[PDB]
Tab-separated table of C-alpha atoms in Angstrom:
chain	number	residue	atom	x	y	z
A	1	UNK	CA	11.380	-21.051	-57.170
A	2	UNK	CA	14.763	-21.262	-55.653
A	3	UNK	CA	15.441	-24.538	-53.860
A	4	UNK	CA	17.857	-26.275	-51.553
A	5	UNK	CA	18.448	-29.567	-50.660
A	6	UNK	CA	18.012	-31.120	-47.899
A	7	UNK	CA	15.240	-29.608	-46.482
A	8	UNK	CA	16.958	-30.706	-42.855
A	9	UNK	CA	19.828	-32.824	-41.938
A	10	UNK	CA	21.607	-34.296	-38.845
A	11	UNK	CA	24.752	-34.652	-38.540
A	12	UNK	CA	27.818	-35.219	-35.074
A	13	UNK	CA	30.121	-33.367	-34.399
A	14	UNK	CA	33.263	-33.495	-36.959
A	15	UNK	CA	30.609	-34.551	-39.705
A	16	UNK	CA	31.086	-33.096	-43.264
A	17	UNK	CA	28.042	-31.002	-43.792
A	18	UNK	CA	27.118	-30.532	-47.646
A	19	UNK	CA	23.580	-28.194	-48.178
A	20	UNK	CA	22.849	-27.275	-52.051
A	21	UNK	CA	20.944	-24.623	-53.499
A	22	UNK	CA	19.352	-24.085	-56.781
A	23	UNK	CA	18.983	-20.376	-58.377
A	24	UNK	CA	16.102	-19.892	-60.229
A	25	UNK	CA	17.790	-18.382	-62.754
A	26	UNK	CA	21.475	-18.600	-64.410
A	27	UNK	CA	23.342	-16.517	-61.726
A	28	UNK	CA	23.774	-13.052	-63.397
A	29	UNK	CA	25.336	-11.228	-59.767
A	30	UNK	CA	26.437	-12.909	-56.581
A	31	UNK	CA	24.905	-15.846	-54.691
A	32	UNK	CA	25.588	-15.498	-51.423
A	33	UNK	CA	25.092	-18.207	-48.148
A	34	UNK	CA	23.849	-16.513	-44.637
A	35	UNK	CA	23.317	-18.534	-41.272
A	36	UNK	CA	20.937	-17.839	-39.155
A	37	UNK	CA	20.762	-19.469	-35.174
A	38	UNK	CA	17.936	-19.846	-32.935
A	39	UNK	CA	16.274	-16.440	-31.540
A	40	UNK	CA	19.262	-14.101	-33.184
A	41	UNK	CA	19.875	-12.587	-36.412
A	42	UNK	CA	21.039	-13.854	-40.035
A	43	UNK	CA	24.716	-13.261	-40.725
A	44	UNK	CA	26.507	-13.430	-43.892
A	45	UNK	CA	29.039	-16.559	-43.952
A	46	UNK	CA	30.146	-16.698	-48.113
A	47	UNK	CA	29.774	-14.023	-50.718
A	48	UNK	CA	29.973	-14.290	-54.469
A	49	UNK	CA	29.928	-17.955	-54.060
A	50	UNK	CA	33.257	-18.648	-52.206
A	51	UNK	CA	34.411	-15.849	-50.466
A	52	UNK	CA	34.700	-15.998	-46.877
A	53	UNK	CA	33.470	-12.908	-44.870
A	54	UNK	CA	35.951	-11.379	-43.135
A	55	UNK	CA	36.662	-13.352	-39.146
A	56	UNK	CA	34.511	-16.517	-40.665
A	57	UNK	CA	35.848	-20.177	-39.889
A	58	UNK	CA	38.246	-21.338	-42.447
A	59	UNK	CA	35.716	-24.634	-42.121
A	60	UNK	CA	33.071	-23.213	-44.133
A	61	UNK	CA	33.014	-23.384	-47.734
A	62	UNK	CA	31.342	-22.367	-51.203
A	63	UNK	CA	31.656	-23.802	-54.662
A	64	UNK	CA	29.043	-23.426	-57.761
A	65	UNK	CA	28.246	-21.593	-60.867
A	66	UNK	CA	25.180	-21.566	-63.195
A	67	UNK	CA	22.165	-22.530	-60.995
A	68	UNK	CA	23.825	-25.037	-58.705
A	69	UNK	CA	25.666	-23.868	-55.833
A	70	UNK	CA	27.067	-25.818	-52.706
A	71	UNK	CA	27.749	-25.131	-48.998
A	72	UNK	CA	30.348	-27.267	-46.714
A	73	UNK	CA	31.246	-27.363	-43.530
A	74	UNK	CA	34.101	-29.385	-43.207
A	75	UNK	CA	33.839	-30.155	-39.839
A	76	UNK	CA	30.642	-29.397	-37.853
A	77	UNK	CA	31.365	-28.092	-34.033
A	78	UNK	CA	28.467	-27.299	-31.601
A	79	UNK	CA	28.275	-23.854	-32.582
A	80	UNK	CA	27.275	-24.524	-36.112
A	81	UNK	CA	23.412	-25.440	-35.536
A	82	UNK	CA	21.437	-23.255	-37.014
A	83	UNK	CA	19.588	-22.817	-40.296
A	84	UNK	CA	21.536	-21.881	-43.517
A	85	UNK	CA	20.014	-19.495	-46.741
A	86	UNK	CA	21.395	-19.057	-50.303
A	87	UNK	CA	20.358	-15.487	-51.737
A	88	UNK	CA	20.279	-14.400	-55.173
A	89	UNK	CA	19.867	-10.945	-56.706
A	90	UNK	CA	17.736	-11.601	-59.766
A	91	UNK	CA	15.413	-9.457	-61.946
A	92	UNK	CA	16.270	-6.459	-59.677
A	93	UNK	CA	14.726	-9.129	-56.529
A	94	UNK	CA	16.983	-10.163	-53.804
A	95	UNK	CA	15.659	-13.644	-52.775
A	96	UNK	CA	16.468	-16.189	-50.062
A	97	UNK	CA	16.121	-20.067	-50.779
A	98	UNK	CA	13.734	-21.790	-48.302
A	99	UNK	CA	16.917	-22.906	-45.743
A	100	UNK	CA	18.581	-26.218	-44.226
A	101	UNK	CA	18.015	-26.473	-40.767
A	102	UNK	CA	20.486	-28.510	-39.292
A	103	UNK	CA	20.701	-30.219	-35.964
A	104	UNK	CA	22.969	-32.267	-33.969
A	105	UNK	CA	22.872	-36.691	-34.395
A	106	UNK	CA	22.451	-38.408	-31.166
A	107	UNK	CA	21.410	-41.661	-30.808
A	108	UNK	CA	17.582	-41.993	-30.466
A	109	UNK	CA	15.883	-41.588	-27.683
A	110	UNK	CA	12.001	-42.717	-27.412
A	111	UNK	CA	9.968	-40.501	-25.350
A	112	UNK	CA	8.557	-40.621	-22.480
A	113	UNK	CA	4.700	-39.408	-22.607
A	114	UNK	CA	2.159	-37.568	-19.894
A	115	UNK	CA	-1.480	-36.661	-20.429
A	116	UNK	CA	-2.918	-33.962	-18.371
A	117	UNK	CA	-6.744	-33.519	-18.236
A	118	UNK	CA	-8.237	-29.951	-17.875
A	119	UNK	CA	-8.396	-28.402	-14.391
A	120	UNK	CA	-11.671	-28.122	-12.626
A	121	UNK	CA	-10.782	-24.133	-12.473
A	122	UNK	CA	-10.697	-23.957	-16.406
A	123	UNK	CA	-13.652	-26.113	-16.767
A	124	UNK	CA	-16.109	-23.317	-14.878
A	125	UNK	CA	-14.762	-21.075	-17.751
A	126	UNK	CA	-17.107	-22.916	-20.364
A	127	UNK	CA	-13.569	-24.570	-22.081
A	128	UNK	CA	-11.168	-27.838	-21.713
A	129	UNK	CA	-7.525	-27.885	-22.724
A	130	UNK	CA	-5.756	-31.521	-22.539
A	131	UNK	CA	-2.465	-31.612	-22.751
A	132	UNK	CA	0.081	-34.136	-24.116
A	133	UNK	CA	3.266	-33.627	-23.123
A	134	UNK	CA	6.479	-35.973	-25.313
A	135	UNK	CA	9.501	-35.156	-23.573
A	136	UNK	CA	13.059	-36.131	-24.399
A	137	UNK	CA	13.513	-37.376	-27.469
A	138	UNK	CA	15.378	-37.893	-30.452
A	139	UNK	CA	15.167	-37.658	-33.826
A	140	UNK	CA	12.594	-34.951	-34.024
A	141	UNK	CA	10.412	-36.519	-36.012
A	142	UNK	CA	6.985	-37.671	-34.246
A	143	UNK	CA	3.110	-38.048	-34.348
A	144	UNK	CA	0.691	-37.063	-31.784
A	145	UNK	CA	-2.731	-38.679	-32.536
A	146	UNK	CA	-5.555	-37.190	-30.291
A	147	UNK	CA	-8.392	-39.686	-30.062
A	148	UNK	CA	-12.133	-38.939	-27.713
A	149	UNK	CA	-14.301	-42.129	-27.285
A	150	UNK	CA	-12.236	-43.793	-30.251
A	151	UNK	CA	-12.443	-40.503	-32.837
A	152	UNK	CA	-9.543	-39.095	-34.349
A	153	UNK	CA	-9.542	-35.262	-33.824
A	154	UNK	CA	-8.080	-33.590	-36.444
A	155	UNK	CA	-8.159	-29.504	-36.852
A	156	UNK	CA	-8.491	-28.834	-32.573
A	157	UNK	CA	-4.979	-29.239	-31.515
A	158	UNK	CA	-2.330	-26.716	-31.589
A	159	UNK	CA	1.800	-28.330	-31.201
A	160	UNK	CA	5.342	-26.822	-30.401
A	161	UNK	CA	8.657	-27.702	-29.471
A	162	UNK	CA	11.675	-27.085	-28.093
A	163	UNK	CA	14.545	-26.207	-29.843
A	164	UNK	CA	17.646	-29.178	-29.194
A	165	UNK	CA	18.830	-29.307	-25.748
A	166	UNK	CA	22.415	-27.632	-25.874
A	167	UNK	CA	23.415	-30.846	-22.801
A	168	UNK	CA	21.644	-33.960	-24.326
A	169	UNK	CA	20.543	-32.941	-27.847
A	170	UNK	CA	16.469	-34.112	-27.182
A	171	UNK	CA	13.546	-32.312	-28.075
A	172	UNK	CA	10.068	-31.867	-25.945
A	173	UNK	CA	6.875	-31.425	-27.591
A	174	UNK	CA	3.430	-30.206	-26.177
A	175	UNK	CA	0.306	-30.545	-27.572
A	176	UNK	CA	-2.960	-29.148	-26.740
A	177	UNK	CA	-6.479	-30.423	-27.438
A	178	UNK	CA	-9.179	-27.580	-26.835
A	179	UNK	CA	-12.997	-28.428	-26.669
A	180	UNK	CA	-16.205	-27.017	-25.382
A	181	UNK	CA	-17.178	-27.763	-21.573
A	182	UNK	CA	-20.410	-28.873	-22.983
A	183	UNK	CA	-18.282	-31.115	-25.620
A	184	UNK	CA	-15.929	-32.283	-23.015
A	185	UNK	CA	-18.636	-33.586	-20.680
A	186	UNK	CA	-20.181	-35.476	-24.152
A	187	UNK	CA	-17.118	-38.249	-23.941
A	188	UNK	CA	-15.455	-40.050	-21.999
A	189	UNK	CA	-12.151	-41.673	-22.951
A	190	UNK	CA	-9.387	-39.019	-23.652
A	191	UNK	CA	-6.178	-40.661	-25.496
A	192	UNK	CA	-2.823	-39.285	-26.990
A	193	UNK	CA	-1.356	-41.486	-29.002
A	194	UNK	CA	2.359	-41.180	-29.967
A	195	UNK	CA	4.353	-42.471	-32.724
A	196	UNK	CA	8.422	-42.648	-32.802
A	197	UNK	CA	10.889	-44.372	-34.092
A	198	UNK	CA	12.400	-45.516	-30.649
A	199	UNK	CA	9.168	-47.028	-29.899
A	200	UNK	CA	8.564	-50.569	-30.913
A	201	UNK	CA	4.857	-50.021	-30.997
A	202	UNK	CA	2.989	-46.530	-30.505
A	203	UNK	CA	2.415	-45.439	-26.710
A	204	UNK	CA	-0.930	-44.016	-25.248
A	205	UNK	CA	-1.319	-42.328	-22.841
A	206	UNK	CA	-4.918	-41.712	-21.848
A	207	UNK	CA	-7.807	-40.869	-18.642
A	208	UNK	CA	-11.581	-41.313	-18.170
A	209	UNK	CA	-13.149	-37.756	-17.949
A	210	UNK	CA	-14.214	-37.188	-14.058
A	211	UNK	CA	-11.650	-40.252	-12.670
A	212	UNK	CA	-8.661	-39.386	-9.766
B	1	UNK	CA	30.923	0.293	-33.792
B	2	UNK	CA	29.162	-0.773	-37.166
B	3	UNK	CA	25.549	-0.709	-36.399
B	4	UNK	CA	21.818	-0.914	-37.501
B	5	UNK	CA	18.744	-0.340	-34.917
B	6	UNK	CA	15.281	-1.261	-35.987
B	7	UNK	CA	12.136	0.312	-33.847
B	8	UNK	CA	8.706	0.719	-34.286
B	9	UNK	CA	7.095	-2.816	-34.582
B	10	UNK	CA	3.875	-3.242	-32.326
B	11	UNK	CA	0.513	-4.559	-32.748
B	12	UNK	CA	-1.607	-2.763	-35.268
B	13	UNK	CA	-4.961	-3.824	-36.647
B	14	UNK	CA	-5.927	-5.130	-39.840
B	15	UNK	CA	-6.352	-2.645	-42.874
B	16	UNK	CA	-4.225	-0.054	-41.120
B	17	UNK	CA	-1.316	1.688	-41.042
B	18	UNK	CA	2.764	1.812	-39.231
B	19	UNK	CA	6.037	3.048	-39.957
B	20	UNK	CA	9.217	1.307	-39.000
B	21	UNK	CA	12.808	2.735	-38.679
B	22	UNK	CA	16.367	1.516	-39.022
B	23	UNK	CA	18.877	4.097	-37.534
B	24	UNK	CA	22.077	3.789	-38.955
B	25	UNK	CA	25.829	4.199	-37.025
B	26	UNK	CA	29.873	3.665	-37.545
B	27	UNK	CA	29.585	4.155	-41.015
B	28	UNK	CA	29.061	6.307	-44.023
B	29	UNK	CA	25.304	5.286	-44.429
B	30	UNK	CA	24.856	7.694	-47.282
B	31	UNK	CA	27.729	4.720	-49.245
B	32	UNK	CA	25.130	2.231	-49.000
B	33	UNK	CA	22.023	0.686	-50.386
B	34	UNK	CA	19.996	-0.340	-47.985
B	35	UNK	CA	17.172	-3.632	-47.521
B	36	UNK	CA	13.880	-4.534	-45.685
B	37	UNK	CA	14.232	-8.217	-44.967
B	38	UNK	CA	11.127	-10.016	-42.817
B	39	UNK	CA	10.504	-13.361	-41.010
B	40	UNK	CA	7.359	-14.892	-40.545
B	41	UNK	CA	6.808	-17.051	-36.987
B	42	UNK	CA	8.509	-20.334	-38.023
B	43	UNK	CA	9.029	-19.323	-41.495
B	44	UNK	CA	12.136	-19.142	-43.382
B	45	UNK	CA	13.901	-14.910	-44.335
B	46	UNK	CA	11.877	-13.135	-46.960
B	47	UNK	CA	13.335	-9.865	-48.912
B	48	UNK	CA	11.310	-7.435	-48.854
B	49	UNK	CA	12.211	-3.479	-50.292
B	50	UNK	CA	15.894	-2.036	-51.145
B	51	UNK	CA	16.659	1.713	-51.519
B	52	UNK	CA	19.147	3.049	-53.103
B	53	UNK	CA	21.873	5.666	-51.697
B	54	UNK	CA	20.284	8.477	-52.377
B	55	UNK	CA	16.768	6.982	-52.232
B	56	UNK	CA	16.266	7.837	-56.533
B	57	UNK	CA	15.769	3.677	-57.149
B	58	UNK	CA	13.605	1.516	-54.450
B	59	UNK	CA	12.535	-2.050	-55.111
B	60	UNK	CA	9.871	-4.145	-53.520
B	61	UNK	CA	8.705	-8.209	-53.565
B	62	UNK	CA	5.780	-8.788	-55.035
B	63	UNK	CA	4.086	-9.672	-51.880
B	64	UNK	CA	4.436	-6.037	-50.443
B	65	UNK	CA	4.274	-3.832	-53.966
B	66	UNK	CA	1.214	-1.232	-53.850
B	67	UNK	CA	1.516	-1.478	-50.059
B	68	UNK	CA	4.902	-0.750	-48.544
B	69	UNK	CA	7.039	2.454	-49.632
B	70	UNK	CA	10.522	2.442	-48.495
B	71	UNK	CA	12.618	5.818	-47.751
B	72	UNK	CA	15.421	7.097	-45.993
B	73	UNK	CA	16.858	10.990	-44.501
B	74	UNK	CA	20.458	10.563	-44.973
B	75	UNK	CA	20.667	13.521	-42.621
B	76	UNK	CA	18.717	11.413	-39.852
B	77	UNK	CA	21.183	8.503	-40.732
B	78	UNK	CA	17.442	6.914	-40.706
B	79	UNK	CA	15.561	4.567	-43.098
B	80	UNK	CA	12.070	3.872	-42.981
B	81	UNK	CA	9.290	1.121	-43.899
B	82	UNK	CA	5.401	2.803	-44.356
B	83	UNK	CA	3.438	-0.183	-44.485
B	84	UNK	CA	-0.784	0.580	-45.205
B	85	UNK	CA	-3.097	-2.214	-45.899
B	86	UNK	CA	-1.896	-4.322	-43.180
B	87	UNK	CA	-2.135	-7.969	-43.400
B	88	UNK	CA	-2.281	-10.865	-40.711
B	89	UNK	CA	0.576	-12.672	-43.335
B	90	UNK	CA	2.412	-9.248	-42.690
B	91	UNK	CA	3.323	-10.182	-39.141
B	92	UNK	CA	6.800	-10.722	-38.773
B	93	UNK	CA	10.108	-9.853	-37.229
B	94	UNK	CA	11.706	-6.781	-39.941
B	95	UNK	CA	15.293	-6.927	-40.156
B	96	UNK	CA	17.402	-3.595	-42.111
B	97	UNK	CA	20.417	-4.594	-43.347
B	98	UNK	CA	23.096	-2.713	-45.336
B	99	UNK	CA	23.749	-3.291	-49.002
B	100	UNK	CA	27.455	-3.711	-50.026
B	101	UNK	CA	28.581	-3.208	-53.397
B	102	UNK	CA	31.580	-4.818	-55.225
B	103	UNK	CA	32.828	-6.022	-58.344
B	104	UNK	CA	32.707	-4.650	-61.609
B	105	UNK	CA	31.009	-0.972	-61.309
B	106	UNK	CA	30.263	-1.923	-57.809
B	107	UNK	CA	27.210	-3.706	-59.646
B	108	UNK	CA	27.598	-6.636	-57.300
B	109	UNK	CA	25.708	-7.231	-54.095
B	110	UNK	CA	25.494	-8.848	-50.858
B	111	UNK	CA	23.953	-7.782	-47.289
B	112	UNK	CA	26.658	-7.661	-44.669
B	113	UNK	CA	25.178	-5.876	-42.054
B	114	UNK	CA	21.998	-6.611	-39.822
B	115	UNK	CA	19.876	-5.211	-36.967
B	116	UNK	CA	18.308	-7.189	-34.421
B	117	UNK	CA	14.634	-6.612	-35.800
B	118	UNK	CA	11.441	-5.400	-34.288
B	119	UNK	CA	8.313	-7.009	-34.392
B	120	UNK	CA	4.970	-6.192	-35.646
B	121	UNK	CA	1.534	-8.069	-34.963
B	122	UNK	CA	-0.837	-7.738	-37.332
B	123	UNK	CA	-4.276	-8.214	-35.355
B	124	UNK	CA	-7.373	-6.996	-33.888
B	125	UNK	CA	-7.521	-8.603	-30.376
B	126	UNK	CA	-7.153	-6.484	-27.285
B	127	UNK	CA	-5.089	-6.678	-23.953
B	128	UNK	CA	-5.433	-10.024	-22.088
B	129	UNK	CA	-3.642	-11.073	-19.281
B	130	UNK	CA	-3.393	-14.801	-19.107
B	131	UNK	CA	-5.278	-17.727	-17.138
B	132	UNK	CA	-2.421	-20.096	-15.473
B	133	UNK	CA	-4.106	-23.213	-15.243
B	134	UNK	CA	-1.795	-26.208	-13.236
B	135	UNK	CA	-0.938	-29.695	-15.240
B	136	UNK	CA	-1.476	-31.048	-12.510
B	137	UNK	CA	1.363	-34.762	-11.785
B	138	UNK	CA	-0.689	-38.303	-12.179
B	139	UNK	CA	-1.839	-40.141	-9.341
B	140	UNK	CA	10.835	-42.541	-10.967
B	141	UNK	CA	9.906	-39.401	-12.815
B	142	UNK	CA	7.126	-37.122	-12.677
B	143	UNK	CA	5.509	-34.078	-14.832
B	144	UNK	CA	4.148	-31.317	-14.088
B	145	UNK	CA	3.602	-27.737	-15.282
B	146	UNK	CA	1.776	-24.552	-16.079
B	147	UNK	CA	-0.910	-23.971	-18.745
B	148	UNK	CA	-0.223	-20.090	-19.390
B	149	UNK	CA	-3.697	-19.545	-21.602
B	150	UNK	CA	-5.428	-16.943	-23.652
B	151	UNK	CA	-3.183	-13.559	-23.428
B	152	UNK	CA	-2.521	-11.139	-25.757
B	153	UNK	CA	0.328	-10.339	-27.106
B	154	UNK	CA	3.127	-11.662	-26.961
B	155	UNK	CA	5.570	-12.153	-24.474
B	156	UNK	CA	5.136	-14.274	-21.252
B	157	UNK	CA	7.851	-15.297	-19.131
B	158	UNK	CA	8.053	-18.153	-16.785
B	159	UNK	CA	10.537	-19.324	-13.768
B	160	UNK	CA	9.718	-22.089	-11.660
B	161	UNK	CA	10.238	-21.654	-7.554
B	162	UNK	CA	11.464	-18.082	-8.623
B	163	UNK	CA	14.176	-18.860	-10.985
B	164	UNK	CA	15.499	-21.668	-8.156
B	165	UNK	CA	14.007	-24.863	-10.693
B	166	UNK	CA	15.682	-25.278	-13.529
B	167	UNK	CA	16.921	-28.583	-14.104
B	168	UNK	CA	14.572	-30.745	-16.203
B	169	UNK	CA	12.206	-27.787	-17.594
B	170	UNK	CA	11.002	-26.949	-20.893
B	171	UNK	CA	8.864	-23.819	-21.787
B	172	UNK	CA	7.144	-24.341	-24.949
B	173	UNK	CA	7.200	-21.696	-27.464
B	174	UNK	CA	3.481	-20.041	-27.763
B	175	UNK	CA	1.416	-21.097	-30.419
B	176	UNK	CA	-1.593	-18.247	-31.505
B	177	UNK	CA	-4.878	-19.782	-31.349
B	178	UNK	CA	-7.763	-18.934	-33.637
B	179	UNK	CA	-9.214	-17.087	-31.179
B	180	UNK	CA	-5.904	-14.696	-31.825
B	181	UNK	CA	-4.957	-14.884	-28.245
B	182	UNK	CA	-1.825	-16.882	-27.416
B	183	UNK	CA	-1.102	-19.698	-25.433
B	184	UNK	CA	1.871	-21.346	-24.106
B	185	UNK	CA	2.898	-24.154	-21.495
B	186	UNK	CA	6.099	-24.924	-19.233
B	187	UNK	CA	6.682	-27.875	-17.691
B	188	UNK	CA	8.994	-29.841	-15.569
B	189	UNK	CA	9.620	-33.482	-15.040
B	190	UNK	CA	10.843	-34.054	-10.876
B	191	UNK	CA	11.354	-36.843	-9.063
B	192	UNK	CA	7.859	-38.551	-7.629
B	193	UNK	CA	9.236	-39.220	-4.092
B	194	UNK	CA	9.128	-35.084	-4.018
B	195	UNK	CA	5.551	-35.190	-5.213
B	196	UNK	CA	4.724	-34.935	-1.058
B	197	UNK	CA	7.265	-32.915	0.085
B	198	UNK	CA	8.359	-29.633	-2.392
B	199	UNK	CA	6.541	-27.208	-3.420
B	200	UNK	CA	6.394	-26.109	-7.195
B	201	UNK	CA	5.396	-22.714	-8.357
B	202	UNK	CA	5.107	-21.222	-11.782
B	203	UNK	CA	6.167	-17.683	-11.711
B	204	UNK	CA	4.179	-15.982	-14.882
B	205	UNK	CA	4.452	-12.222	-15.962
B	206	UNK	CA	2.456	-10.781	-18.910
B	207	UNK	CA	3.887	-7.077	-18.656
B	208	UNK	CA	1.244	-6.282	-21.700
B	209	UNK	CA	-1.409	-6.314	-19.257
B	210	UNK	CA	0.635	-5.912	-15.714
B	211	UNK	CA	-0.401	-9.340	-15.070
B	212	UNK	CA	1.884	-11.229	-12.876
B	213	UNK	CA	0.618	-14.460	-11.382
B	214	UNK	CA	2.314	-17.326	-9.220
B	215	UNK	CA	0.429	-20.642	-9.787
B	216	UNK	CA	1.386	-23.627	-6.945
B	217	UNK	CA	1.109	-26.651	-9.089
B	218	UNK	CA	0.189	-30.005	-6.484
B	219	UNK	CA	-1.671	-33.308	-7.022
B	220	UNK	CA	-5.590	-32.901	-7.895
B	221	UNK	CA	-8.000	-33.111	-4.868
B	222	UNK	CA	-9.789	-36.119	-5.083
């Protein structure tokens, strides 16, 4: 049960950055810190609590003993997003802590919203996809809420997004609703309704099944 | 040059059965402990199994213990992960990484050195090239994109206008239906005065299945 805290944080460029772990245990050998970027590999930043790996950033930092353990970077630069791990060796276990993602502060950005209806081509297939499409924004926290003649659907959407835009520092976010032809052609009014702080009230975006 | 090469990931079915490697180079491998580290899609690192140098001690996570034996040929410069039993919660990316020793008795540990992973999939679907399906721009700023549905497995790649669009697009990273086949989209967001004039094609290839498809994406037919 190893923690760290925060879960996620933003933070500009030059921010102090300050992640901390908790060992399960009183640390008996070394706790280590790794960061880890989008798509690539971890690599080792601080060993036995403090030590900088050989070629790392004088920027990053350790501190700690016991259970409690902390991470700095004094400085963030652009290159620094990525997730960050604590690792213990205890009861003959390595274990990582659950990670600090950490992403770039902008200032927020509502988005903007599209709803696609299902082709005519997939409908022949027997199954309907809608799509709801959030593009551009910042922070990444927001809510999709798929409604079908005024019924929340809940369990029959899949989401993703994008990792931060390297230029602007936005996500994107798609969403898919999938339903039977024969369920599809049951309803009429197909909504996605999104929720973000940039919004002063929540958008919808929405079509009548068979309309231009 | 210090390096660690993991192989041997593919798709494999439930209940069965795969070995992975990690070849070892630029170093004295028979020096070092070595570790299986895994990560789950969207999930955080997760240790594994450790060998010792010689391969007389091995350690495994509770998760994988009764399942997973770990092993090396120091004359192969080669360590190995048998997995049996085969989980869907086993699919993952499987990094090797050295173990370094220091301290006291060289008691002390940390993992310095990593491969780039390989990949197992942990399923019983088939081969399935996907259905492109257009999202097609409402009747400023516009959207539009591809619906790249129901392959299997993983990965797709998408261009737009064969690699000459790619200012204002975002491919979505594929989300695994309960169906087990994948599905993705890509979109773009264009100007609407270009709505009549340029032409917008979504260049898919599934090499799984030796599926390539280009989709023209244009206002519905009403």
């Amino acid at each position: 049960q190893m923690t760290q805290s925060p879960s996620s944080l933003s933070a500009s460029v030059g921010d102090r950055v300050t992640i901390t772990c908790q060992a399960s245990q009183v640390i008996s050998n070394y706790l280590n810190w790794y960061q880890q970027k989008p798509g690539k590999a971890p690599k080792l930043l601080i060993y036995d609590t403090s030590n900088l790996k050989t070629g790392v950033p004088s920027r990053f930092s350790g501190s700690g003993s016991g259970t409690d353990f902390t991470f700095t970077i004094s400085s963030l630069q652009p290159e620094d997003i990525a997730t960050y791990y604590c690792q213990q060796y205890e009861n003959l276990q390595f274990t990582f802590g659950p990670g600090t993602k950490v992403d770039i502060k902008r200032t927020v950005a509502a988005p903007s919203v599209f709803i696609f209806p299902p082709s005519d081509e997939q409908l022949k297939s027997g199954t309907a996809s809608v799509v709801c499409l959030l593009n551009n924004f910042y922070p990444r926290e927001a809510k999709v809420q798929w409604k079908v003649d005024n019924a929340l659907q809940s369990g029959n959407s899949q989401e993703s997004v994008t990792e931060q835009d390297s230029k602007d520092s936005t996500y994107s976010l798609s969403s898919t609703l999938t339903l039977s032809k024969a369920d599809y052609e049951k309803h009429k009014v197909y909504a996605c309704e999104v929720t973000h702080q940039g919004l002063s009230s929540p958008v919808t975006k929405s079509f009548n099944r068979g309309e231009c | 040059e210090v390096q660690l090469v993991e192989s041997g990931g593919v798709v494999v079915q439930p209940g069965g059965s795969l070995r992975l490697s990690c070849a070892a180079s630029g170093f004295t491998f028979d020096d070092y402990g070595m570790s299986w580290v895994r990560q789950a899609p969207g999930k955080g690192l997760e240790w594994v199994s450790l060998i010792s140098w010689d391969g007389g001690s091995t350690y495994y996570a509770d998760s994988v213990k009764g399942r997973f034996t770990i092993s090396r040929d120091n004359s192969k410069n080669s360590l190995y992960l048998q997995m049996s039993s085969l989980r869907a919660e086993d699919t993952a990316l499987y990094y090797c990484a050295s173990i370094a020793a220091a301290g006291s008795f060289y008691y002390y540990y940390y993992m310095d050195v990593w491969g780039k992973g390989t990949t197992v999939t942990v399923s019983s679907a088939s081969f399935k090239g996907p259905s492109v399906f257009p999202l097609a721009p409402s009747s400023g700023t516009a959207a539009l994109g591809c619906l790249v549905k129901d392959y299997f497995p993983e990965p797709v790649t998408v261009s737009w206008n064969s690699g000459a669009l790619t200012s204002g697009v975002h491919t979505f990273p594929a989300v695994l239906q309960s169906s087990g086949l994948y599905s993705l989209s890509s979109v773009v967001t264009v100007p609407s005065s270009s709505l009549g004039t340029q032409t917008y094609i979504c260049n898919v290839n599934h090499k799984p299945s030796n599926t390539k498809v280009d989709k023209k994406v244009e206002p519905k037919s009403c």
